[PDB]
Design an enzyme around this catalytic site. Structure first.
Site, PDB file in Angstrom:
ATOM      1  N   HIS B  42       0.814  -1.231   0.000  1.00 29.25           N
ATOM      2  CA  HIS B  42       0.000   0.000   0.000  1.00 29.25           C
ATOM      3  C   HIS B  42       0.843   1.275   0.000  1.00 29.25           C
ATOM      4  O   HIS B  42       0.345   2.328  -0.415  1.00 29.25           O
ATOM      5  CB  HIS B  42      -1.053  -0.004   1.133  1.00 29.25           C
ATOM      6  CG  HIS B  42      -0.528   0.442   2.465  1.00 29.25           C
ATOM      7  ND1 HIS B  42      -0.212  -0.440   3.491  1.00 29.25           N
ATOM      8  CD2 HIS B  42      -0.300   1.681   2.948  1.00 29.25           C
ATOM      9  CE1 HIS B  42       0.203   0.251   4.542  1.00 29.25           C
ATOM     10  NE2 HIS B  42       0.139   1.542   4.242  1.00 29.25           N
ATOM     11  N   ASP B  88      -0.548  -7.447   1.731  1.00 30.91           N
ATOM     12  CA  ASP B  88       0.082  -6.105   1.810  1.00 30.91           C
ATOM     13  C   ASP B  88       1.602  -6.204   1.970  1.00 30.91           C
ATOM     14  O   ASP B  88       2.152  -5.989   3.056  1.00 30.91           O
ATOM     15  CB  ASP B  88      -0.541  -5.279   2.938  1.00 30.91           C
ATOM     16  CG  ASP B  88      -0.220  -3.805   2.841  1.00 30.91           C
ATOM     17  OD1 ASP B  88       0.344  -3.398   1.799  1.00 30.91           O
ATOM     18  OD2 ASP B  88      -0.533  -3.070   3.808  1.00 30.91           O
ATOM     19  N   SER B 185       3.675   2.608   8.533  1.00 25.60           N
ATOM     20  CA  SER B 185       3.304   1.554   7.567  1.00 25.60           C
ATOM     21  C   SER B 185       4.500   1.127   6.749  1.00 25.60           C
ATOM     22  O   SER B 185       5.308   1.970   6.338  1.00 25.60           O
ATOM     23  CB  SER B 185       2.252   2.057   6.574  1.00 25.60           C
ATOM     24  OG  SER B 185       0.952   1.986   7.119  1.00 25.60           O
ATOM     25  N   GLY B 186       4.614  -0.170   6.500  1.00 30.19           N
ATOM     26  CA  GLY B 186       5.717  -0.661   5.670  1.00 30.19           C
ATOM     27  C   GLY B 186       6.913  -1.071   6.491  1.00 30.19           C
ATOM     28  O   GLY B 186       7.772  -1.822   6.020  1.00 30.19           O
TER      29      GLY B 186
HETATM   30  O1  LIG Z   1      -6.905   4.392   6.422  1.00 27.07           O
HETATM   31  C1  LIG Z   1      -6.463   4.396   7.590  1.00 27.07           C
HETATM   32  C2  LIG Z   1      -5.917   5.653   8.195  1.00 27.07           C
HETATM   33  N1  LIG Z   1      -5.286   5.324   9.466  1.00 27.07           N
HETATM   34  C3  LIG Z   1      -3.924   4.803   9.228  1.00 27.07           C
HETATM   35  C4  LIG Z   1      -3.139   5.192  10.473  1.00 27.07           C
HETATM   36  N2  LIG Z   1      -2.869   4.045  11.360  1.00 27.07           N
HETATM   37  C5  LIG Z   1      -1.889   3.149  11.010  1.00 27.07           C
HETATM   38  O2  LIG Z   1      -1.330   3.297   9.908  1.00 27.07           O
HETATM   39  C6  LIG Z   1      -1.609   2.025  11.889  1.00 27.07           C
HETATM   40  C7  LIG Z   1      -1.998   1.824  13.209  1.00 27.07           C
HETATM   41  C8  LIG Z   1      -1.490   0.598  13.725  1.00 27.07           C
HETATM   42  C9  LIG Z   1      -0.730  -0.078  12.794  1.00 27.07           C
HETATM   43 CL1  LIG Z   1       0.071  -1.612  12.959  1.00 27.07          CL
HETATM   44  S1  LIG Z   1      -0.627   0.745  11.277  1.00 27.07           S
HETATM   45  C10 LIG Z   1      -3.999   6.199  11.233  1.00 27.07           C
HETATM   46  F1  LIG Z   1      -3.249   7.302  11.609  1.00 27.07           F
HETATM   47  C11 LIG Z   1      -5.137   6.541  10.277  1.00 27.07           C
HETATM   48  N3  LIG Z   1      -6.468   3.199   8.386  1.00 27.07           N
HETATM   49  C12 LIG Z   1      -7.015   1.998   7.787  1.00 27.07           C
HETATM   50  C13 LIG Z   1      -8.166   1.402   8.295  1.00 27.07           C
HETATM   51  C14 LIG Z   1      -8.710   0.270   7.690  1.00 27.07           C
HETATM   52  C15 LIG Z   1      -8.058  -0.258   6.556  1.00 27.07           C
HETATM   53  N4  LIG Z   1      -8.648  -1.376   5.891  1.00 27.07           N
HETATM   54  C16 LIG Z   1      -8.555  -2.703   6.399  1.00 27.07           C
HETATM   55  C17 LIG Z   1      -9.125  -3.738   5.722  1.00 27.07           C
HETATM   56  C18 LIG Z   1      -9.857  -3.514   4.512  1.00 27.07           C
HETATM   57  C19 LIG Z   1      -9.952  -2.238   4.031  1.00 27.07           C
HETATM   58  C20 LIG Z   1      -9.363  -1.118   4.689  1.00 27.07           C
HETATM   59  O3  LIG Z   1      -9.400   0.109   4.287  1.00 27.07           O
HETATM   60  C21 LIG Z   1      -6.913   0.318   6.005  1.00 27.07           C
HETATM   61  C22 LIG Z   1      -6.418   1.448   6.651  1.00 27.07           C
HETATM   62  F2  LIG Z   1      -5.304   2.044   6.185  1.00 27.07           F
END
Ligand SMILES: O=C(CN1C[C@H](NC(=O)c2ccc(Cl)s2)[C@@H](F)C1)Nc1ccc(-n2ccccc2=O)cc1F
Ligand SMILES: [Ca+2]
Ligand SMILES: [Cl-]
Ligand SMILES: [Cl-]
Ligand code: NA
Ligand code: NA
Ligand code: NA
Lengths: 42, 234
Positions: B42, B88, B185-186
């Protein structure tokens, strides 16, 4: 059995294995100054 | 990283930082070898073009041991999609080899079956990165690490708005205010076994950061050991 004490292997498991940058002595010995998965010292 | 602490010299040497056209970090990675970095699929979507910085612990000070590497080839899991966040995982092949030194060394790749019974059963792992220090806050200028407990898959599914797949695992805390966050992330999730750290996870996603009743979600590296091996031989 690696089932108990990893078969005494320091790393992979009887037959022992090590990750790259190590050789089998049971124990695993680095082959260089920066073997994988070790915190580095000055 | 929310909570946790700063990585000292040499403590998190497998951390890589992906930097965008603004020379700012936007995702982490894990050094696997001289030529390969492990990251999240991602992350590849989130910069127009990017490079890799290794050896950095403070993004506001140029320190001895920092180096920048361009990416020759990106290998993104074909099955990754943002619809599910499943699969991912990506591997980056660098143009030039990394010189290992203080603060720059690979994390070990475990062997699969052994990893499932031996690593995935440990109490905790360590996640690290330059991400936000609070959900709505700024990215850390300092490299941070955090010990996160492995969380039972079923408790995790119960807590989650989204599907947790076999290619994921959960770690962190129900209510304690510590977690990975945006910008992490990553990056690496590593598990210690007898004096050696093995890469076990890729920071993947979370519903916010450190939310009560929510955990951190990681790509399960043991699910991809063969895939990673093939990618590093391509
Ligand atoms: O989009 C976001 C935005 N978040 C990301 C950030 N949190 C993080 O990146 C993490 C927190 C803990 C870890 Cl480990 S990684 C936060 F600041 C706001 N979170 C998120 C929630 C759910 C999913 N997700 C999960 C499954 C299917 C679809 C889908 O969109 C992906 C995602 F990236
Ligand atoms: Ca720096
Ligand atoms: Cl599944
Ligand atoms: Cl969110
Ligand atoms: Na510390
Ligand atoms: Na457990
Ligand atoms: Na939580």
């Amino acid at each position: 059995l690696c089932s108990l004490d990893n078969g005494d292997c320091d790393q992979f498991c009887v037959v022992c294995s090590c990750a790259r940058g190590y050789t089998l002595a049971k124990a695993c010995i680095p082959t260089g100054p920066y073997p994988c998965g070790k915190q580095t010292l000055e | 990283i929310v909570g946790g602490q700063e990585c000292k010299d040499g403590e998190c040497p497998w951390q890589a930082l992906l930097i965008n056209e603004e020379n700012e970090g936007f995702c982490g990675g894990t050094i696997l070898s001289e030529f390969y970095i492990l990251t999240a699929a991602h992350c590849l979507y989130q910069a127009k073009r990017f490079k890799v910085r290794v050896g950095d612990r403070n993004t506001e000070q140029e320190e001895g041991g920092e180096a920048v590497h361009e990416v020759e080839v990106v290998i993104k899991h074909n099955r990754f999609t943002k619809e599910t966040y499943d699969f991912d995982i990506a591997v980056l092949r660098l143009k030039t080899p990394i010189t290992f030194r203080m603060n720059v060394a690979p994390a070990c790749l475990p062997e699969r079956d052994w990893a499932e019974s031996t690593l995935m059963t440990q109490k905790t792992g360590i996640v690290s990165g330059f991400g936000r220090t609070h959900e709505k806050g700024e990215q850390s200028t300092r490299l941070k690490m955090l010990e996160v407990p492995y969380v039972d898959r079923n408790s995790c599914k119960l807590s989650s708005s989204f599907i947790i797949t076999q290619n994921m695992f959960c770690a962190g805390y129900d209510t304690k205010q510590e977690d990975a966050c945006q910008g992490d992330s990553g990056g690496p999730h590593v598990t210690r076994f007898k004096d050696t750290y093995f890469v076990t996870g890729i920071v993947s996603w979370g519903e916010g950061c450190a939310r009560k009743g929510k955990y951190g979600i990681y790509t399960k590296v043991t699910a991809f050991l063969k895939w990673i091996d093939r990618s590093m031989k391509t």
